Amino acid sequence: MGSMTMDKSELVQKAKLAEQAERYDDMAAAMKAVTEQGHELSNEERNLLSVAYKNVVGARRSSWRVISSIEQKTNEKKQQMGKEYREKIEAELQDICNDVLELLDKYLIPNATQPESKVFYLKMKGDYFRYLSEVASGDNKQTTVSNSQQAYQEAFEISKKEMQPTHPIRLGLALNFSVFYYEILNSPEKACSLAKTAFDEAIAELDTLNEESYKDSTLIMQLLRDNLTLWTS
Amino acid sequence: MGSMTMDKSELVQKAKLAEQAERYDDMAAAMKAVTEQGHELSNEERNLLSVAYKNVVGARRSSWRVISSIEQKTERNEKKQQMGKEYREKIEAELQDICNDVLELLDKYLIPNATQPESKVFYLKMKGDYFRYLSEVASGDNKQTTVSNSQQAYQEAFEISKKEMQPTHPIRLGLALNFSVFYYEILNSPEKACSLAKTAFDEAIAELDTLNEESYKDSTLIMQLLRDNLTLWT
Amino acid sequence: MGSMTMDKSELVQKAKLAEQAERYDDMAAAMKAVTEQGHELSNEERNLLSVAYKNVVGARRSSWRVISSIEQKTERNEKKQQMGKEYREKIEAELQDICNDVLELLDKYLIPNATQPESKVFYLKMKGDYFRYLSEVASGDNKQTTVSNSQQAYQEAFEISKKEMQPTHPIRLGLALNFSVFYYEILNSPEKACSLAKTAFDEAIAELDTLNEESYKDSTLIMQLLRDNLTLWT
Amino acid sequence: MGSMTMDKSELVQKAKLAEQAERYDDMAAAMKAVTEQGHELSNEERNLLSVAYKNVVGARRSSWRVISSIEQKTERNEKKQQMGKEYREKIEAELQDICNDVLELLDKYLIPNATQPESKVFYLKMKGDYFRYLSEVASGDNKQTTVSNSQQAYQEAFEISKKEMQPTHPIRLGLALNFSVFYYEILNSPEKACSLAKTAFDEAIAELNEESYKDSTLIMQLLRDNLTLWTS
Amino acid sequence: ILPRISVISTGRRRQSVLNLMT
Amino acid sequence: RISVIRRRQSVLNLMT
């Protein structure tokens, strides 16, 4: 029929069907159209948009890592084909990320009315600028790196004032922001400091006797510990 | 000369990169272009072509099953059911287009350029397979056409393999495996499916008793699949 | 200093050679000697021990199923019946001895020395597994004992895993898989088995959606096994 | 009970059960006891005995190749090198015990009880085969004798087969196949190996029942495959 | 025989996370 | 269900 003649509920039903079918491009297109109608997303619609684009962008990020790795283990012929193929994937990745960042700037962030929603969407902006920064060369890198750091930093400040240390979004923001420091900024100390602080403050508040009730929090606490272990070994 | 100006070696290298990157649409496009150059494919190229299109069509087969399942469980919502129908039909059209491209390749290039029996059996089996995938979603008289075409391709490959190839040949064994699936799933004939599969397993094990099994590891793996399918089927 | 004069590093290297050579009785003997020297096993050594005994016992479980199926399909021939019974009982005694050695190691060395929850779930699952293997061939009051011991070990591992591990942890997933098999096959409770497997699958999928799946390929492999059992059982 | 109180029919039934159970050491033990009763083996008994030991010795040959391949990939660490050497020697000792048991059955029972030329060629080929398997792992000090013993058995089989059997007979063809493998791989004499295999093939192709045609052509194809591999 | 599969032998990248608040 | 897409030879004679 066409997305421009469809109600929000029909596009959401389409997104859910695409998700079950593991057709994430279809899922992303449906949720992009939902977002472009301009109304603040519900929690369910936010999750559908975020999962769709995580999978769409993630396929390209993973291909890019595979092709970059083959580029290094190599013959001028094979190495130039790998460079061209990588630039092919880079171009798709940049298009995907720019679409998401367009959605964030034009719809999601200016419609965010609650602090939890604002932290989430700022963390998302940081993430997708980080994904741009993973492949950005020379010049344009400085803008995406700065735009990533800025988005994370503002979410970091809201999260520490508005959220308890066991809150999964405060934990997840710290995790990804520390990854940004370690990998993009090559500041392993600050990355380790951020992750260890987040882990220590959460373990100080966590109800050890009802850990069953906080598996969303303990998941990211384990991820933070995993990264600290990996980085200090 | 036209829009595609890579030579065969460049295309094969790109197919290999796309396979590592799990980008099977790219991989299939590369191997389709290799095939359309019109030369007999090497075993390595034949496998790249086969693996690429198996992954491309397999994604649609998987999605089709999921959506068709959802479509038949929506008892009340006439609108979840109409949208599910249209989405299933969108996936079917993709599947039909993918199978069409493969069947085109087989009839234009692959089968007419096959001179050894091993190559004819491999491509006729492939023809049987892709008509079988069409049969999984076809209806009415189109299903009659696809089912008969699948069976005829399998039967021809079957008779060639029986006359020209040993029972331990992996291509002959793989043909027996997929042909039995055809009988079981498409023709709904489980006795025919079980008899084909056990006979192929039995004749292979009898011959392997005489041989050193070290150079037949790929035959043994397919025999284990025949074993597994028989376990499920009875 | 006594009969076993090799040190742990030599035994572990011997175990890895035996594995590559598909000599699993040798592999198990090496890793049993490692365990009996009191070392708390590393993750690598733990996996070697588990792979060794899985294959040692698996060979006997497979032979037992073959001989049992021959014995039960032997109607008129009496002497064949009695010979099949005696052969089955000889294989049963081997299987019982293998499981006894594993359970001895678990009760004497492995479980008492497991201080980390991951190790305790791993070894309690193993205890449940080997009592399950005994239950496959036991009868009478002995079967009552092995079924109860298997359930108790699985249940304790299960509770620990849900308190201390995330749904996506591969040891927690593999425990859910084998506990569901225990309900399905040993307790003949297919709906409870499906319910267990479906909750484990669904809770892992929901958590997996937040994660980079490339770091959890061992989890996704087991989730596919859960899904395959669900397909078979429904 | 025990093998020394079992009739031959019970031992054969035990061997067939062991085969189904993929318990080839049990299968060989049953058929060894059958052979040791001293009767000439039936066709079925011969097949069970040969298949059993093919698999028993074949497991060790496969393991020996795997460990040998590992050894040359770890030639720079002393503890792993000596572990590999000791483990290979353990496998070699099992292989040698298996082959010695078969060779003892051949010399004490199978070859002396063979009444027809076809049977004599079969068991002499088998003697050549199992001395060939000893030769595959033989130490430097023993290799000359095991290689000589293999060649002598194959040659006696070869002379009888040329006198008493049609070029098309699968046992004559199978002897030629394995003897040529002996020449190529053990005696490192590839010209003689190819000469032997080609002559055997060309002699059978000139003399080519639908059932006798099927069995002979399968081994003829194996001769062709080895010739192709060797002249490549 | 009722088919079923028990767990088979099983035998390093930093982690990031997406929050899916239900 | 599943569907799917050297060394010198020696031989053992198994007469029937």
Author numbering:
A (entry chain D): -2 to 71, 74 to 232
B (entry chain C), C (entry chain A): -2 to 231
D (entry chain B): -2 to 205, 209 to 232
E (entry chain F): 748 to 758, 764 to 774
F (entry chain E): 751 to 755, 764 to 774
Paper's wording?
The CFTR protein is a cyclic adenosine 5′-monophosphate (cAMP)–regulated transporter with anion channel activity that conducts Cl− on the apical surface of bronchial epithelial cells. 14-3-3 proteins are dimeric proteins that have been shown to bind to the disordered regulatory (R) domain of CFTR, facilitate trafficking to the plasma membrane and enhance ion channel activity. Here, we report the identification and mechanism of action of a macrocycle stabilizing the 14-3-3/CFTR complex.
Diffraction-quality crystals could be optimized for the complex with CY007424 and the structure was solved at 1.76 Å. Of the 28 residues of the CFTRpS753pS768 peptide, 21 amino acids could be built into the model. CY007424 binds close to pS753 of the CFTR peptide and establishes contacts to 14-3-3, as well as to the peptide. The tyrosine moiety of CY007424 is embedded in a shallow hydrophobic cleft formed by Pro750 and Ile752 of CFTR and Leu229 of 14-3-3β. There is a polar interaction between the main chain nitrogen and carbonyl oxygen of Arg751 of CFTR and the corresponding ring nitrogen and carbonyl of the tyrosine moiety of CY007424. The positions of P750 and R751 flip by around 180° and the side chains of L749 and R751 become visible in the electron density.
